[PDB]
Ligand binder design. Structure first.
Ligand code: COA
Ligand code: PLM
Ligand code: PLM
Lengths: 353, 352
């Protein structure tokens, strides 16, 4: 039932244009023959630029899972601590204040987990509570925020942090010129984000200025395991992405949104600010359509998609910060809407201050 | 909050340690390490383990892609078996579950096991999911702690923890190094589940098992190298450092004194010790650092011999053993696990 005190985004310094990425990409080994479909997919992606953890031309040398995942660990901890620290300072808080840290990634395999490494780097208390969320994927931005409330609900004086870090480009060893993988090369970029939330009694104490987290609802769809996820192997984390995904949103999302807003005696028109995960144009349109939304409602997520691509779990937290910068009217409601491997959906009710 | 059911599940393929060792030395390329292996396997004080696969199939499990696929299918089966068995113990149903947390470190699944388990068992579509990956051997205890944290903010709810560890399935990664060989002497397969309910739900549901009073985590400084995964083309390769036991002997007493002082308790106030069986040298160091009678640790020594090291799942099998022996009402119990971090987790229980 708590309150956000800090949101912060972090990106790798290497920034490229989509056209720059596409032009060099079609010149990679194995790939020139597929230039036509690559150019089409990358144009259709509605992404104009992406940040990457490695120099663009380093990727043809990134063939080994072991190398990729080791670079993942090094670079993910970096970005994660940069994201967290930015969030702490936005929240006028500091590492020793954190009672619990959550960590969301679907894009590398880290044991000891990321939270353990970030905790060691930023000097959080040895008794900090660790929640390593792996395999929630694109939904983990909303889901991590929900889990933070679930913690702070039972701890009103407490501070809890979520750090999302997604380095999609490092899954390159698993990438080959098949359609689904290539779709991936069109949308996904790298980035990280951190949310610092505080308990209700701690909220007055630290002048927590962000939105109130009022409630959440998970929604898991039957017989939809195959829709999204990885097919993990020796060449690494290989994307699975069915075309059927968009259809599932169109038939069931309106239902899940209306069933949830009802329980608060609100309807979707009472929502003053939408914060939706930017999966891709067809997806964003789908949630626009099925929810009968004006095109202004999802503008920030279209723009985030455009500027930095799809960041998996971190995207919705970037778009969340963008809307916090926008300063919606006080007392008005907001709704986080994320979806990913499951197939599932996550709704988080917000109240703007 | 308060535990309502604890249930372990194992593969039906069970083999004596000697069955295993004999077969193992004849595997591809480990004929010239017969001596070191036989020494390692005999000194593990494991007498048998459950394998999720036929013992003869392992020589063919050379591909990480193969092994992980088999992981996913076998792990949802075992996990479902444990939840069902803990649900039955609680006399509760799949529809009662408000939050499922899953712990594994032996396979990589997206979507996660909780996704797949919820599907197979028909949990509510609005069930809260908390897949935990990379806690390793601490997750059996740290999982119970996460449940108590959830149920403290939701005292009317039901939260479960399913721990599934299929360690044998990491065979693609093992080679004749001391580290990997030690792991092939120690680790077994199996699963376990815990059902727990909020305080306001405890009466209405007649929750049998122990209250969950508190927990403390302890993340040691500059200790990444102690335990973890070397991830690569061949899958998940064991990273296990000699300095582990000396870490315990140096810092374990501090961790537990610090925790118990916050409740003004002494080591003698603890009626039941529920510790992870990380092998003989680890169990010795727990006893030694905490000056415990050979009595106090016997239930985990027993688990180690019968079933082997099940990663996060072992401590829950032992929690079921301690419960079924019924400690005296109102007496205190301490779960004590350790995993990659390096970290340590303590959970304080009160019994019935
Ligand atoms: C990737 C994307 C930007 C490109 O779309 P686009 O160029 O208009 O192309 P279309 O979707 O109209 O589909 C046309 C073709 O691409 C194929 N295609 C699109 N997405 C595909 C996928 N995920 N897997 C396999 N094929 C796919 C179609 O099957 C079709 O092939 P065909 O002409 O031979 O029949 C768009 O499909 C999209 O937004 N996908 C959603 C991404 C997603 O699922 N994100 C999940 C995060 S929640
Ligand atoms: C050509 C250089 C850049 C390549 C950039 C994209 C590399 C990765 C492609 C697959 C991305 C998958 C992201 C999946 C997130 C999820 O499953 O939730
Ligand atoms: C004939 C083979 C029998 C089975 C041999 C299985 C050997 C498994 C070795 C690796 C176990 C790894 C457990 C790691 C737990 C953790 O991450 O803390």
């Amino acid at each position: 039932m708590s309150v956000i005190a800090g949101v912060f985004g972090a990106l790798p310094p290497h920034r490229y244009s989509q056209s720059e990425i596409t032009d060099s990409f079609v010149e990679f080994p194995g790939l020139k023959e597929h230039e036509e479909i690559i150019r089409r997919l990358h144009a259709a992606a509605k992404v104009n630029g992406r940040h990457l953890v490695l120099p663009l031309q380093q990727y043809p040398s990134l063939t080994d899972f072991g190398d990729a995942n080791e670079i993942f660990i090094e670079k993910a901890v970096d970005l994660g601590v940069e994201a967290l620290l930015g969030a702490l300072d936005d929240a006028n808080l500091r590492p020793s204040d954190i009672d619990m840290i959550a960590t969301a990634t679907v894009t590398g395999v880290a044991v000891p987990s990321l939270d353990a490494r970030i905790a060691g780097r930023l000097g959080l208390r040895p008794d900090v509570r660790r929640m390593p969320l792996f395999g929630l994927g694109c939904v983990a931005g909303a889901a991590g925020v929900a889990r933070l409330r679930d913690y702070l609900r039972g701890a009103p004086d407490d501070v809890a942090v979520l750090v999302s870090v997604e380095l999609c480009s490092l899954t390159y060893p698993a990438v080959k010129p098949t359609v689904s993988s290539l779709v991936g090369t069109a949308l996904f970029g790298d980035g990280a984000a951190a949310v610092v939330a505080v308990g209700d009694r701690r909220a007055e104490q630290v002048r927590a200025g962000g939105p109130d987290i009022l409630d959440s609802r998970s929604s898991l769809y039957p017989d939809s395991l195959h829709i999204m996820g990885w097919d993990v192997g020796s060449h690494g984390l290989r994307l699975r992405l069915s075309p059927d995904l968009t259809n599932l949103i169109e038939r069931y999302l309106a239902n899940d949104v209306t069933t949830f807003l009802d329980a608060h005696r609100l309807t979707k028109d009472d929502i003053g600010a939408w914060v939706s995960h930017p999966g891709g144009p067809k997806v964003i349109d789908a949630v626009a359509t099925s929810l009968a939304l004006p095109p202004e409602a999802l503008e920030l997520t279209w723009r985030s998609l455009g500027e930095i691509g799809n960041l998996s779990s971190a995207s919705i937290l970037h778009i969340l910060r963008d809307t916090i910068e926008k300063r919606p009217p006080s007392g008005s409601a907001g709704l986080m809407l994320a979806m990913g491997p499951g197939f599932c959906t996550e709704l988080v009710l917000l109240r703007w201050r």
